[PDB]
Design a protein around this ligand. Structure first.
Ligand SMILES: Nc1ncnc2c1ncn2[C@@H]1O[C@H](COP(=O)(O)OP(=O)(O)OP(=O)(O)O)[C@@H](O)[C@H]1O
Ligand SMILES: [Mg+2]
Ligand SMILES: [Zn+2]
Ligand SMILES: [Zn+2]
Lengths: 559, 43, 114, 49, 264, 196, 86, 160, 65, 158, 133, 141
RNA sequence: AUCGAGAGG
């Protein structure tokens, strides 16, 4: 297991990673110190010799350089310590161990390697700092974060291996993932929030900013788009400028909820010939989702064009957002005074409902359905009451939040946040649960020594009427800590069991390959499937489409 | 330093979870993340 | 460890010229100038003053990376107008304005008392 | 500010982590598993003073 | 007076000058503030050699503090960049050498100030290298504290530099910048709970511009032309010189661009 | 990292001119993304910002004690008394342009902690190097100039990609390839081989 | 054993070139070019062996034959010129 | 249970219907009970499904259980991957577990089996049975440092 | 451990102020906000340098060698 | 109605309506025979397995049945004219593009589909994070280990 | 290279929804009972009074990279106060002897309903909308 | 003097504790909305009272500011990271030859402090700095 | 080298 299936390897590197908005999706930022350490063996040809000699003259101490020269005899000339490091006269067929240079195939990896996406080929770009740099839209396949994560880099040593990395493992190829038959990369974080802000009909751009954004797109045609508004002042829309990033010939049609062809609320999406007709751009349009811009552009234009689309969109949106600004404060968690009154009244009515159900149960007037304890019925009813209370208070809060509220902005764009976050921060965090039940009596008939015995009230069993803004009480805080400990245990313990499961799954199906007769066989030749997936289709080239004959009435079918 | 001095260990039916009787005796928040989660406690 | 020396932000290196001028493909009468060892201070002023010029159809400056001190200026001008001359005129107008500012501030400061 | 509470062995400062055990001399009743022939057990772990 | 930008100095002191810059595009005012921060040169300690150190502070700590010391740089144009003067390492024409010797002779703590720095190089009659003291006591920046029996003896070489190389060569501390205090241009979109007027505090500079009128439509064509600035100096250089040299350095950069064209 | 579980690493270092500035000329020592906030749900971070802003302006210590009646409304009343907007927002200008940011920025003093993880204590790269005696495989550890391990999961990942030659290169040419002599009849590497 | 060959007429394997065999063909050709091998397409300012091999694949001048093995042990051989690249 | 069913018009409509859920499994006896629909009865225990209805029904129930586990999280995995797993389990004619008991005991080569679990026992029994490893497996070539018959390694490149 | 020479964010020198500040608190019986005001520290970035500083050098001085 | 299928017919139709500038006012130059016979020919053209013998032909017919159902629903004669004002040129281009995309959608022999399947199952499992029935990773362990005794057996009677 | 359409409408309602600067506009054609209009207007650039009467025009001209007005030697084709450029996305028929046309000026939308403009408003990227007080 | 007692957990089983002394007060509505919802105790027969509820925390969690407004796992994370924070671990650091030591140049006391901190000696020996932090999107680095 | 311990995602 430890020396044959896996082993430590040469020509490897590893370091902390941060992200770079100005790096390309398939590119990786490699520190100079790493570049001067890792070498590629390059055989001198008439094509490369004039460069190679220079590198060997440039020396191993400064990049682009080289560290070793291998003669025909197999002797290695060390350029660090050699009296002949100066007068080297390269002969054809010799090998030069050149420094790793820009646009060189490497394999980039993050060690929880659950995906083939976890190891992807990248184009080297050498950088002046100690961290690995990578594009934001490539974080998702690696599950990468910049809170301190370290990533690893491997260097091919033969041209065949470089071809394998560039023709199979390249990042643009892996855009459409075979699992889930959808793209795995998309527009995230600042780019996504800014793209929603930019696509708004209210967003208008002046001539100077328009020109700078147009130049910012690397493949700009130089044709300044005709401004949407002309006479009172030449005003472009954000959609117009962003349409420059969209390649010509791209058509995207999506209808959302109540979307007319007049799109009154700017919902939905219509794009014709790489120009957006209506709608606000958000996670649906430009995320990893099926039928998004990434899937459509990869299928129609090709993986390379989509990979460049990532960078073009990022440049435009990041520039506009930098000059627009975005922020979040405690003011984004405050709810109106009347809204807070209504939230507390919702909590109080839920408390009254719980109390009345309890008084009913104590009177033995409750009747439990078949297969359920009377106490089980009581528990289910109280839990449902309190969960409904939390959800209703949170919805009150979210309706109260204005469009300028930045948490609501991030949720609308889809860059971060959820409804439950708004509810817990602004209205109340609700009921805490351990092992599927409310907090129990660790003490005799009491959850805490501060309560009376045989107390079943919501606050006694771990209901937090307080939002994170209001602040948890002592008992609420202890109950919440009890709840969170369970999640910490689940992380630290689940990981091992899921890893064991994945190892067994991989060892069970490792030999399963599609042979040249379209069958799916194991090492011994036994047929697992006579055709892969029973349709013979690679999972990446597959999208959900509707079968129009199956649905509807017979009359509509006839028509 | 203080924290390393105020530290316990439980060598091994639900030891890891924060028990009710831990109130006021063991810190509810301070625990290692990883294999020693819940088993290692701080006073 | 890997950090470039701070002096690289303003000192031109060997084989590096301040301005590199290259014709622009996909546009008529347009040029791209690569200001080396320069930052936003010069770029924004030059671009705004170019935008003042009537016969300048396009002017935009970008910094392709925060790591490196350099920027790119794209200028497209009217037929019969060399973009290099447009840049020269923008520079001279900038300098005239700055000199006027220096003179007027000096008079005002001489007026003040403390 | 140093609060002490440690030892110095061969120049290295060393702390003794408290070891948590269940008290002896406590009688506890546990239902044995359903397949087990005995329904309940009462156990005492008597430790000398 | 002269056509173009127009300055009205509201208040002025040796430390701060608060003025109004009129009839100017924003890019120019921003470039001027960036130059005032980064590009106007000063003199600062860029080399320290420690003969003896028995203080509780380490040498790197003290050298960093010494580089942070403000030094007179009014005549800094008569000094030359060390990289731009032909000596082997440094000379009198491109550097100023200072000495610091302090012994804790007193039982009570002996403090060290920037006044305790002495100059060994020949100034050659230019106002340069004198440590800046604005303390009413006359004692400088507290460099170190010494117990009885502790000595610090070292030599500093101060050279010419800019804040874009290291913040120690910083002539100005903080520059206050505001345009359109009434937000007539609508260059910002206010964040509010109930009312932007009530929740957002009013600017002082709001008095200087005429208040807006609700009946009139929004002036789309209008661009920001009047700017309210306050420049505060460390004291290594007078404030008036801070702004004047910012102007001059920006001019020099533009002129070097023009010369680069002529040489192209 | 701040005192609320918000860990992060430096992505870029900006000089004061490039940094966004308030009207007072104040500048952030540190800029964090709003996107860290809504998912983590650490309100106390923003409350620390607000309370510390009031504490710096007033010169009095801020009481961030748990289980106190310190409310955001009162702290914001104090901050408004000090002339700044009650919710801690401040109008800020782009450093590169001088144009007012359309947004108003949550701006304030926050306690931050420098952690024991630094990049230059982590950097590693090997190429060729020292090898362990028994396995003839690259040694372990940064301190020994060792080789990063190509784990079983990584072998599986390369298998899913279909890059067989890269796998053979990682598994022999980069770790422990060796040439040995076997007898055709014996079937075992018991051949005594004198090459010269 | 002997004669596991299948005649070109009645060959059932895919007329198109699999991503894996294109990758191996390009890699082998790039290795050959890197080891000072003759090039059968005229170069146009091209010096990377992989790009030379890609151009040769486009112009169908790579003189290599892919031998595909059916699970029974019979082999079907396709010249790179025969196979379709898409 | 709500249910989508063809209306007389042809359109699909929601017909709620009564459904029984039982805490134990006695499949064989229960489906013979009158008044039920024996064609639609279902168990969450797929082994009973295999016992009562045959191996194909076992494979179908296996896919159903795996799918529901995946879809509880909201996670979606394409049919083919789960189908590959289920067909691998059911291709022997019975339920082969992904365990040292189920798939590691097979006719496959010794090295591939020893790379998972019970390594030395497998190697010893290979020595005693005089087993011959085909080396057709990936793990065998990985141990031998040879190119596996995987992707690039499946076909053979030959000169013209 | 000793007073920072200048405010990290502005660069306004604060190393000359420290001692005065202390005498403003003790001799004059002043509160910290007004003391920082008298020292000319008007921006809170400058105020935190003096207000939150801990002068650990005094503890370091007590060590005999 | 919505299921994962190889070739997105709708996108191809929109591409045709834009590439050839379809005009609704003008009458289509397509024959009824053209539409019906061309769709039949396109069905004949799509091949997953290329054997001549009848069992392989039947297997291919199986493999293409559902996609042919989609093709028939999307390219019916009333739809090809009334729903989209497709000219004959657009129709022929749609046919050829459908064939090309389908042939590009086929699996490439050499895909290590077992390893891909195992990873595709395992990655969501490790991401799983948390009523009357066993669920999640424990239930998955039960399923994978063919555990004779499960925590929550259940029978669903209709 | 001439005018495609002209009319004078009256505003019924003006409604900004979640928009500070843009308003949706409902209008009815004068002298044409069956002709109506819907439009997204920048009210900050041109406010729209309720029950206001406005002249509206659609033109083909008066691709090529946009050039600023420079010296104004280029002559306006617009006595109008509000002009936009857009692209039409759909051309549907609402009923026999009636048509409806959709336009998108940079995401600002417009829908016009009238019977006779078969030759006019042909499908094209080209579009100029003009509005006079 | 019997004003304070030591309570085992086993003895905790048999007692009734109040969180604050104000709970032992008469009752007779108009409240500040921003304050937390505190339950009317509606209970009697108290035998004890907590010294202060914030004492349930350990040394590490006593450093956290406003942890009652934070989701608990983040409090755990911070408790694990304050031990990784850098500061003056002792004032005699120059005297001892520790294998590794890291010390801040200019340590700052926190602007937001716990009342527990005084007994933890944090303000006297801090391990962080009061950095001016802006929350903003700015070039997206 | 073995064994233990602590941390990181
Ligand atoms: N699509 C996403 N949606 C919501 N939150 C996300 C998303 N992606 C990442 N996160 C956040 O990133 C964190 C998840 O931790 P993550 O799984 O990335 O770390 P890990 O290395 O896998 O395990 P650990 O850190 O516990 O050792 C959480 O804070 C989560 O909220
Ligand atoms: Mg993480
Ligand atoms: Zn000199
Ligand atoms: Zn300051």
């Amino acid at each position: 297991r430890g020396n044959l299936m896996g082993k430590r390897v040469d020509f490897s590197a590893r370091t902390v990673i941060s992200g770079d908005p100005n790096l390309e999706l398939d590119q990786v930022g490699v520190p100079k110190s790493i570049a001067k350490t890792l070498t590629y063996p390059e055989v001198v040809t008439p094509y490369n010799i004039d460069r190679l000699t220079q590198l060997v003259r440039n020396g191993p101490n400064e990049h682009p350089g080289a560290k070793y020269v291998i003669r025909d005899s197999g002797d290695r000339i060390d350029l660090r310590y050699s009296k002949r490091a100066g007068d080297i006269q390269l002969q054809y067929g010799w090998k030069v161990e050149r420094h790793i240079m820009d646009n060189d195939p490497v394999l980039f990896n993050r060690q929880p390697s659950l995906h083939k996406m976890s190891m992807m080929a990248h184009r080297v770009k050498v950088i002046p700092y100690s961290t690995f740099r990578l594009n934001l839209s490539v974080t998702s396949p690696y599950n990468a974060d910049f809170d301190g994560d370290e990533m690893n880099l491997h260097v091919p040593q033969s041209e065949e291996t470089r071809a394998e990395l560039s023709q199979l493992c390249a990042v643009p190829l892996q855009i459409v993932s075979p699992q889930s038959n959808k793209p795995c990369m998309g527009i995230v974080q600042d780019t996504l929030c800014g793209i929603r802000k930019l696509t708004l009909r209210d967003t208008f751009i002046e001539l100077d900013q328009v020109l700078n954004m147009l130049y910012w797109v690397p493949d700009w045609d130089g044709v300044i788009p005709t401004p949407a508004i002309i006479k009172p002042k030449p005003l472009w829309s954000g959609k117009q400028i962003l349409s420059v990033a969209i390649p010509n010939g791209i058509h995207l049609q999506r209808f959302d909820e109540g979307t007319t062809l007049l799109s009154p609320k700017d919902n939905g999406m219509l794009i014709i010939d790489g120009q957006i007709i209506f709608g606000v751009v958000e996670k649906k349009t430009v995320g990893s989702s099926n039928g998004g811009l990434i899937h459509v552009v990869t299928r129609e234009k090709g993986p390379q064009v989509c990979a460049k689309l990532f960078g073009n969109i990022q440049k435009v949106v990041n520039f506009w957002l930098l000059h627009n600004g975005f922020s979040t404060g405690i003011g984004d968690t405050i709810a109106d005074g009347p809204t807070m009154r209504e939230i507390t009244e919702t909590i109080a009515e839920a408390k009254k409902k719980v109390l009345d159900v309890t008084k009913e149960a104590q009177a033995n007037l409750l009747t439990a359905k078949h297969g359920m304890t009377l106490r089980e019925s009581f528990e289910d009813n109280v839990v449902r009451f309190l969960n409904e209370a939390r959800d209703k208070a949170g919805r009150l809060a979210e309706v109260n939040l204005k469009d300028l509220n930045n948490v609501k902005q991030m949720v609308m764009a889809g860059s971060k946040g959820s409804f439950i976050n708004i509810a817990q921060m602004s209205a109340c965090v609700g009921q805490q649960s351990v092992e599927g039940k409310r907090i129990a009596f660790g003490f005799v008939d009491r959850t805490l020594p501060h309560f009376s015995k045989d107390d079943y009230s919501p606050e006694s069993k771990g209901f937090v009427e307080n939002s994170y803004l209001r602040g948890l009480t002592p008992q609420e805080f202890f109950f919440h800590a009890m709840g969170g400990r369970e999640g910490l245990i689940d992380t630290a313990v689940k990981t091992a069991e899921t890893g064991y499961i994945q190892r067994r799954l991989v060892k069970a199906l490792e030999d399963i390959m599609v042979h040249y007769d379209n069958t799916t066989r194991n090492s011994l030749g036994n047929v697992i499937q006579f055709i892969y997936g029973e349709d013979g289709m690679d999972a990446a080239h597959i999208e959900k489409q509707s079968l129009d004959t199956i649905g509807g009435s017979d009359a509509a079918f006839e028509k | 330093t203080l924290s390393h001095l105020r530290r316990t260990n439980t060598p091994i039916a639900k030891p890891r979870q924060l028990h009710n009787t831990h109130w006021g005796l063991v810190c509810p928040a301070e625990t290692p993340e990883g294999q020693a989660c819940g088993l290692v406690k701080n006073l | 460890m890997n950090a470039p020396d701070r002096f690289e932000l303003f000192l031109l290196g060997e084989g590096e010229s301040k301005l590199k001028i290259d014709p622009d493909t996909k546009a008529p009468n347009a040029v791209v100038i690569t200001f080396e060892k320069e930052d936003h201070t010069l770029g924004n002023l030059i671009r705004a003053e170019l935008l003042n010029d009537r016969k300048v159809l396009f002017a935009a400056y970008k910094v392709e990376h925060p790591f490196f001190a350099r920027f790119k200026l794209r200028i497209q001008t009217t037929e019969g107008y060399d973009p290099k001359d447009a840049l020269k005129n923008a520079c001279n107008s900038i300098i005239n304005k700055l000199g006027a500012l220096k003179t007027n501030f000096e008079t005002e400061w001489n007026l003040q008392t403390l | 500010f140093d609060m002490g509470g440690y030892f110095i062995i061969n120049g290295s400062e060393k702390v003794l982590i408290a070891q948590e055990r269940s008290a002896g001399n406590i009688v506890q009743v546990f239902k044995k598993a359903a397949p087990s022939p005995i329904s309940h057990v009462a156990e005492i772990r008597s430790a000398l003073e | 007076s002269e056509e173009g930008p127009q300055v009205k100095i509201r208040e002025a002191s040796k430390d701060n000058v608060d003025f109004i810059l009129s009839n100017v595009d924003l890019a120019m005012a921003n470039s001027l503030r960036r130059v005032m921060i980064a590009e106007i040169p000063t003199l600062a300690i860029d080399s320290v050699e420690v003969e003896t150190n028995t203080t509780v502070l380490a040498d790197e700590f003290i050298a960093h503090r010494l580089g942070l010391i403000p030094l007179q740089s009014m005549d800094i144009e008569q000094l030359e960049y060390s990289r731009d003067c032909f000596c082997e390492d440094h000379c009198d024409k491109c550097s100023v050498v200072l000495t610091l010797q302090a012994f804790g002779e007193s039982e009570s703590t002996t403090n060290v100030y920037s006044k305790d720095l002495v100059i060994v190089s020949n100034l050659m009659g230019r106002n340069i290298g004198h440590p800046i003291i604005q303390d009413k006591e006359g004692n400088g920046v507290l460099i170190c504290k010494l117990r009885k029996g502790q000595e610090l003896k070292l030599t500093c070489v101060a050279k010419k530099g800019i804040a874009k190389e290291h913040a120690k060569w910083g002539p100005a501390a903080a520059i206050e910048f505001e345009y359109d205090p009434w937000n007539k241009l609508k260059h910002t979109d206010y964040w509010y709970e109930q009312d932007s007027a009530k929740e957002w505090p009013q600017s002082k500079n709001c008095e200087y511009e005429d208040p807006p009128n609700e009946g009139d439509p929004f002036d789309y064509k209008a661009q920001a032309d009047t700017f309210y600035m306050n420049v505060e100096s460390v004291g290594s250089i007078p404030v008036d010189q801070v702004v004047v040299r910012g102007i001059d350095t920006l001019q020099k950069k533009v002129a070097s661009i023009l010369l680069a064209l002529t040489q192209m | 990292a701040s005192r609320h579980g918000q860990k992060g690493t430096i992505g870029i270092t900006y000089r004061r001119e490039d940094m966004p500035f308030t009207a007072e000329g104040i500048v952030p020592d540190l800029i964090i993304n709003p996107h860290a906030i809504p998912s983590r749900m650490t309100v106390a971070h923003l409350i620390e910002c607000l309370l510390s802003k009031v504490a710096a302006l007033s010169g009095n210590e801020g009481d961030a004690s748990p289980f106190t009646d310190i409310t955001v409304e009162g702290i914001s009343k104090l901050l408004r008394e000090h002339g700044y907007q009650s919710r801690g927002f401040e109008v800020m200008y782009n450093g590169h342009t001088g144009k007012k940011l359309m947004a108003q920025i949550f701006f304030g003093p926050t306690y931050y902690q420098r952690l024991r993880h630094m990049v230059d204590d982590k950097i590693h790269a090997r190429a060729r190097g020292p090898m362990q005696v028994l396995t003839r495989q690259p040694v372990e550890g940064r301190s020994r100039d060792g080789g990063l391990r190509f784990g079983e999961m990584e072998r599986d990942c390369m298998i899913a990609h279909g890059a067989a030659s890269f796998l053979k290169e990682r598994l022999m040419e980069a770790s422990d390839a060796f040439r040995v002599h076997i007898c055709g009849i014996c079937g075992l590497m018991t051949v005594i081989a004198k090459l010269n | 054993l002997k004669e596991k060959a299948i005649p070109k007429d009645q060959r059932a394997t895919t007329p198109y070139m699999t991503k894996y065999e294109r990758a191996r063909i390009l890699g082998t050709r790039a290795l050959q070019i890197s080891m000072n091998a003759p090039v059968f397409v005229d170069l146009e300012g091209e010096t990377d062996p992989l790009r030379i091999a890609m151009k040769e694949l486009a112009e169908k001048k790579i003189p290599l034959v892919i031998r595909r093995y059916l699970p029974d042990g019979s082999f079907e051989d396709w010249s790179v010129e025969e196979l379709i690249v898409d | 249970y709500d249910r989508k069913v063809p209306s007389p018009t042809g359109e699909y409509v929601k017909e709620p219907e009564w459904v029984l859920e039982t805490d134990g499994v006695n499949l064989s006896e229960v489906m013979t009970v009158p008044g039920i629909d024996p064609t639609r009865i279902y168990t969450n225990s797929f082994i009973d499904i295999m016992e009562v209805l045959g191996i194909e029904a076992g494979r179908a129930a296996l896919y159903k259980e795996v799918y529901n586990v995946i879809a509880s999280d909201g996670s979606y995995v394409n049919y083919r991957h789960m189908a590959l797993l289920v067909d691998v389990m059911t291709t022997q004619g019975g339920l082969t577990s992904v365990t040292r008991h189920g798939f590691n005991r097979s006719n496959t080569g010794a090295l591939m089996r020893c790379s998972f679990e019970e390594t030395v026992e497998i190697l010893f029994e290979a020595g005693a049975s005089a087993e011959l490893d085909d080396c057709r497996g990936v793990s065998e070539n990985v141990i031998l440092g040879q190119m596996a018959p995987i992707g690039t390694g499946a076909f053979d490149v030959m000169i013209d | 451990m000793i007073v920072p020479v200048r405010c990290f964010s502005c660069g306004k020198v604060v190393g000359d102020k420290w001692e005065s500040y202390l005498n403003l608190l003790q001799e004059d019986e002043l509160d910290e906000g007004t003391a920082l005001s008298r020292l000319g520290l008007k921006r809170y970035c400058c105020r935190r340098m003096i207000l939150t500083h801990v002068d650990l050098i005094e503890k370091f001085l007590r060590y005999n060698p | 109605a919505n299921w994962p299928l190889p070739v997105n017919i709708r996108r191809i139709i929109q591409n045709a309506q834009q590439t050839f500038h379809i005009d609704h006012t003008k009458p289509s130059d397509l024959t009824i025979k053209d539409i019906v016979l061309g769709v039949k020919d396109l069905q004949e053209n799509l091949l997953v397995l290329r054997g001549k013998n009848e069992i392989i032909q039947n297997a291919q017919r199986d493999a293409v049945t559902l996609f042919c159902c989609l093709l028939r629903s999307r390219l019916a004669t009333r739809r090809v004219l009334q729903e989209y004002r497709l000219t004959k040129q657009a129709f022929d281009w749609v046919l050829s593009n459908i064939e090309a995309q389908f042939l590009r959608s086929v699996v490439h022999p050499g895909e290590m589909v077992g390893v891909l399947a195992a990873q595709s199952i395992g990655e969501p499992a490790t991401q799983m994070t948390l009523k009357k029935v066993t669920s999640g990773v424990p239930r998955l362990k039960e399923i994978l280990n063919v555990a004779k005794n499960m925590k929550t057996p259940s029978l669903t009677v209709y | 290279s001439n005018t495609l359409f002209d009319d004078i409408f009256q505003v019924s309602e003006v409604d900004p929804g979640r928009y500070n600067k843009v308003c949706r506009i409902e209008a009815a054609s004068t002298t044409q009972d069956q002709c109506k209009l819907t439009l997204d207007i920048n009210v900050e650039l041109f406010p729209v009074a309720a029950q206001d009467s406005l002249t509206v025009t659609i033109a083909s001209s008066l691709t090529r990279s946009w050039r600023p007005p420079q010296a104004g030697d280029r002559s306006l084709a617009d006595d109008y106060d509000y002009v936009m450029y857009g692209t039409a996305y759909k051309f549907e028929e609402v009923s026999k002897d009636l048509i409806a046309v959709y336009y998108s000026f940079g995401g600002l939308l417009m829908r016009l309903e009238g019977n006779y403009r078969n030759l006019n408003n042909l499908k094209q990227e080209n579009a100029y909308l003009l509005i006079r007080r | 003097e019997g004003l304070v007692e030591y309570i085992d957990a086993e003895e905790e089983e048999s007692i009734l504790i109040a969180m604050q002394p104000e709970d032992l007060e008469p009752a007779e509505l108009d409240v500040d909305p921003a304050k937390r919802i505190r339950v009317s105790h509606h209970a009697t027969t108290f035998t004890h009272c907590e010294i202060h509820p914030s004492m349930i925390l350990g040394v590490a969690a006593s450093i956290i500011p406003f942890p009652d407004h934070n989701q608990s796992p983040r409090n755990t994370y911070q408790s694990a990271m304050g031990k990784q924070a850098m500061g003056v671990f002792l004032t005699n650091y120059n005297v001892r030859m520790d294998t590794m030591a890291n010390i801040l140049y200019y340590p700052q006391k926190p602007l937001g402090t716990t009342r527990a901190m005084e007994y933890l000696k944090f303000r006297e020996l801090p391990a962080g700095q009061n950095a001016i932090v802006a929350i903003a999107c700015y070039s997206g680095y």
